[PDB]
Amino acid sequence: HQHPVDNAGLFSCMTFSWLSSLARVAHKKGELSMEDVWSLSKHESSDVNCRRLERLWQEELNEVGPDAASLRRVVWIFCRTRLILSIVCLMITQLAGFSGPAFMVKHLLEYTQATESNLQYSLLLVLGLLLTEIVRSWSLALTWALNYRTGVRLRGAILTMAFKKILKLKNIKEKSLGELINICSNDGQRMFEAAAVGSLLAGGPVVAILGMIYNVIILGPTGFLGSAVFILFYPAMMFASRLTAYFRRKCVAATDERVQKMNEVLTYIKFIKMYAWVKAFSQSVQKIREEERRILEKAGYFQSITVGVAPIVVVIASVVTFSVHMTLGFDLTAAQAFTVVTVFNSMTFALKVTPFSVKSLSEASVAVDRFKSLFLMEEVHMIKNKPASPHIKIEMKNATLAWDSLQRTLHSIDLEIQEGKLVGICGSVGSGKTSLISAILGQMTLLEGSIAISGTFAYVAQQAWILNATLRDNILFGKEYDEERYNSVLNSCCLRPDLAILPSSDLTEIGERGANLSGGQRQRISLARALYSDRSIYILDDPLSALDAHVGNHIFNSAIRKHLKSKTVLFVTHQLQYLVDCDEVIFMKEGCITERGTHEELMNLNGDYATIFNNLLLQGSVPWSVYGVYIQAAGGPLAFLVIMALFMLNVGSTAFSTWWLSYWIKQGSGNTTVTRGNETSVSDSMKDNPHMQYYASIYALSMAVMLILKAIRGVVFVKGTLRASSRLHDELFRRILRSPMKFFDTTPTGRILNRFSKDMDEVDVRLPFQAEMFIQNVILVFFCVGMIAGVFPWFLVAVGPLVILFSVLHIVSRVLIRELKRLDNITQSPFLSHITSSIQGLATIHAYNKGQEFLHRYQELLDDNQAPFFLFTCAMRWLAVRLDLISIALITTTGLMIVLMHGQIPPAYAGLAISYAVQLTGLFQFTVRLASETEARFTSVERINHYIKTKNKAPSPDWPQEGEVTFENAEMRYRENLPLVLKKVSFTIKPKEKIGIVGRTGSGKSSLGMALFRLVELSGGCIKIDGVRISDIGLADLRSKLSIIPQEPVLFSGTVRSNLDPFNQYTEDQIWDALERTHMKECIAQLPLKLESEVMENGDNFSVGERQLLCIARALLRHCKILILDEATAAMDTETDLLIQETIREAFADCTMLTIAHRLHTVLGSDRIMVLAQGQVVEFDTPSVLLSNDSSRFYAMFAAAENKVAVK
């Protein structure tokens, strides 16, 4: 039966032994492939379960009605038959995992206390213990198998129904926030988890109740205190979890703000370095980091108070019960005490899994509510009426429709067209053509009139849908491939030029791409698809919205007039050009019919259409270096030693408390003789000993000591790990990524913004948690083995082969698990891609007929994703069962060891060995899983560490005054692999002289500005300012003088005062004087807080002119002797332009002025004009002389610019 699951018997299904061959193949080969994973096993396909659920829901709706219908009843009825069997198996395992400690151990200890010699009794008891262990383990395996299969079935069915519903929506208004995910995406994983890890809820209370009753039976009124301890304990941990969640949410808000600021200042680095403004941003980031650190610290304390639930509770309950029981006058023995302790050690198993069940159930309930909210919407309704006459295609007779908002836009619409007729519709903006287009497709609701439609539609929207596939099939849209049709379509739409542009051929994709395409080409492929589809009636809505006249004419005369001569065409557009050739024109205005007839008749009528026409014509290897780096960053070996010492001290304290309990009992009476009864005798009772308060005092002291040590350990570990994480990344990374050069160009800025947002989370939140859990588990295992082997020295024989077996099995398990995970991870993505591409643009999908193709593709991709999930879960259960077998063997060995030696060991030590052997169950799986999880988190540190690893000449400040600018053959190159931009450039500028820069783009205009600031080192020559070489002056000293106004005005978040002067080097009087000169003082004065008013990002509070005026203000604040102006007139109005020229000439008239712009009039008034071409200086003369020379290129450019106005 194909899949092996359907052929296995009961024994193979109970042990998961049908998966064994895959492990052997994975070991032999090295990696797996999708060719031999498996297929799907039937009984889990989408169609069968979808039909079943649909039938159930329809029956429910018919039975009750759409007011009180519930999805919970339907889901329960769907999953009713198997949950009962799962519950029965769980009850059997919980009942059989308690009969061991309560009945088997007590009889064994009581036998040890007796004075006989038998082997049959002890052998029978050993047999009983082993059999109970086996039964418990195998029952648990069966429960898990059943639950996994049921969950997979339910998830598939619900997801397929959810995506089936969406394709028939006629009120699409919710954004792609619910539809894309919460209905057909990972939202079904919650419904899977509710049946996989949900349920299992009646597992804790039952065993807890049974244990409480048994304890009261054994001891009684003094045995009635363990219940009190447990009840008073657990709600405290609930409260601690709530507080941790609250603090975590607040920290999330703060770090979101920090990363927002980091993104804001990551790409302005030229602006920052041009003024040497690196001080402020460091301060701001440091403050935000401090606040985040404090909140994280508090959350860490409250989260770490929790991880020690079980042994602490056991010790507390035992101490209280036994102390109160003894300090009243009573009797105790080894059997009772150690039976009670062993029972206390088995109550705390299902209380390790109840909370996950509760939270999973809550999430599932919310998801079901959302699904039921979706399932009630308006369906589709397609018109099936046929025209009375065969010559009629569309029919309209006094039909009125209202758009559902119900808003009327159409009123008494009547028209009639026939096959082979071209009809054009004209109207203004908002006339109501779109309402008619929406009504003819049947989307609009019907209120009055009759509708008749025959034919097939071909719809071209004003926007291209663009489908994630190859060009050939995208044009094909699921049609048979041909040759003459294909080339006729290409020639008709003149797509051949575009084919040569494509790198490879017409086989690439039109998805995200790297070059995208133009709107006109998208329109061209849209009409290509439409006219290749070969439908009956064509609906064309303004396909030529943004095209040139020529291509419109060729497209028209090639396709519309020839191909669709006999095909009905409906044309809706605003332009009145092609309407000459149309055989019918209908004018729509104010939702009523105005004109009807041919074009010539329309001109004959001479109505509003004539007026409008006239107006228009007018891998994960992770070597040890990572661990070494983390340890070195944490502080050194001393921190490691301190933390390990504290862990060992805590666990040793717990072990000492239990040992003292064992040591008190052995000292029976103390060779004390009493005269009770009628004759003297030596008592054997523990109460008779005169010294009893000693031992109770030492008990209380032990409890207090253990509590104090646990608190100290938690605090110290949290603080140390937080310091280790906070130093490395931020301190040694932000200080380095603020002084590279050119590194910012040949590297995307979207992958340096990352590693500041995700890696910080991975290093701050999860690593300490996982490390703490792992270390605690390992140390506990070591202590348990040592404590057992201390009493019986021969126990260190059955530990060797078990270690060898564990080492053999672990590697195979790890390889199989990794390989199975990778396949699911790789195969996830096309599912999501198809879902997104289908959700975007439902109109065209519903336009022709296509629903079945998309549904089939969805189902196929669903199954291909589903299979490896099931395989992965089965592998995990396989490993768990093997480890359980090892533990059972160890327990049986120690029990037999106790039995075989009798009469030479006191009963108390035998009880202690038994009490410590039971604790070993269910630890190895936890240890292995936690080791893998904490290994997977040590990858971020590697990337961060990799990215981290990869004079004098101070003269007097006489720079001002005679500020001469001289160039002597300056050469520079942007990169070492590119041609030199500047080639022997030399010029001298006199002080207080105005110079303009003109030339074509790419000829080296920006090179002068880049090299004047020494941002890129020159390759030859030298530049001297005021007789001082710029190479001998420090970068900080040189940049503090010159100023440049950028072509685009940018502003940062904060107050106006910070945006004007962050260094607080100026008082208010100069700021007001500067603001008054640019006539913006009144605007700031009108602000309620003036200079304290808050400024949003990008300066959205102000208009463009205000931003530019603020830029000139901050330029005027510095009072520089040398100024560079760079294209201040990009898209700014003429009034503001004359304003800025007036302000510049009134303010910058006492300093050297250099201008680089595309407007000749800006540099017309300059003393001299510079012309550059191909990196060489061409012309250097006054404007009067340059204009007088015809051969000058500047004069030719001026004539060409002037001809654009005089001629036109």
Author numbering: 97 to 501, 574 to 786, 838 to 1169, 1179 to 1436
Paste lines from the article.
Since the R motif does not contribute to the EM density in the central cavity of hMRP5, we generated a further truncation mutant hMRP5-Δ1-94 by removing the flexible region from Met1-Thr94. This deletion did not have an significantly impact on the ATPase activity and overall inward-open conformation of hMRP5, suggesting hMRP5-Δ1-94 retains dynamic conformational changes to enable substrate transport despite lacking the N-terminus. However, the peptide-derived density was lost in the corresponding position of hMRP5-Δ1-94. This indicates the central cavity density arose from the Met1-Thr94 flexible region, revealing an auto-blocking mechanism where hMRP5 is inhibited by its own N-terminal fragment. Collectively, removal of the autoinhibitory peptide does not disrupt the ATPase activity or conformational cycling of hMRP5; thereby, the empty conformatin of hMRP5-Δ1-94 likely represents a critical apo state primed for substrate recruitment. We found that the helix backbones remained unchanged during the transition from the peptide-autoinhibited state to the apo form. However, the side chain orientations of several residues differed, including Tyr244 (TM2), Glu289 (TM3), Phe452 (TM6), Phe988 (TM9), Lys1040 (TM10), and Arg1148 (TM12). In the apo form, the Phe452 side chain reoriented toward Phe988 (Phe452-Phe988 distance ~8.4 Å). In the apo form, Lys1040 rearranged towards the cytosolic side. Meanwhile, Arg1148 moved from the cytosolic side to the pocket center, likely due to the loss of the electrostatic interaction from phosphorylated Ser60.
Human multidrug resistance protein 5 (hMRP5) effluxes anticancer and antivirus drugs, driving multidrug resistance. To uncover the mechanism of hMRP5, we determine six distinct cryo-EM structures, revealing an autoinhibitory N-terminal peptide that must dissociate to permit subsequent substrate recruitment. Human MRP5 was demonstrated to play a critical function in regulating cellular cyclic GMP (cGMP) homeostasis, which is essential for many physiological processes, including the maintenance of vascular smooth muscle tone and cardiac contractility. hMRP5 also influences signaling transduction pathways and may contribute to drug resistance in anticancer and antivirus therapy. From a clinical oncology perspective, hMRP5 can directly contribute to cancer drug resistance through the efflux of many anticancer drugs, such as methotrexate, cisplatin, purine analogs, pyrimidine analogs, doxorubicin, and antifolates from cells.
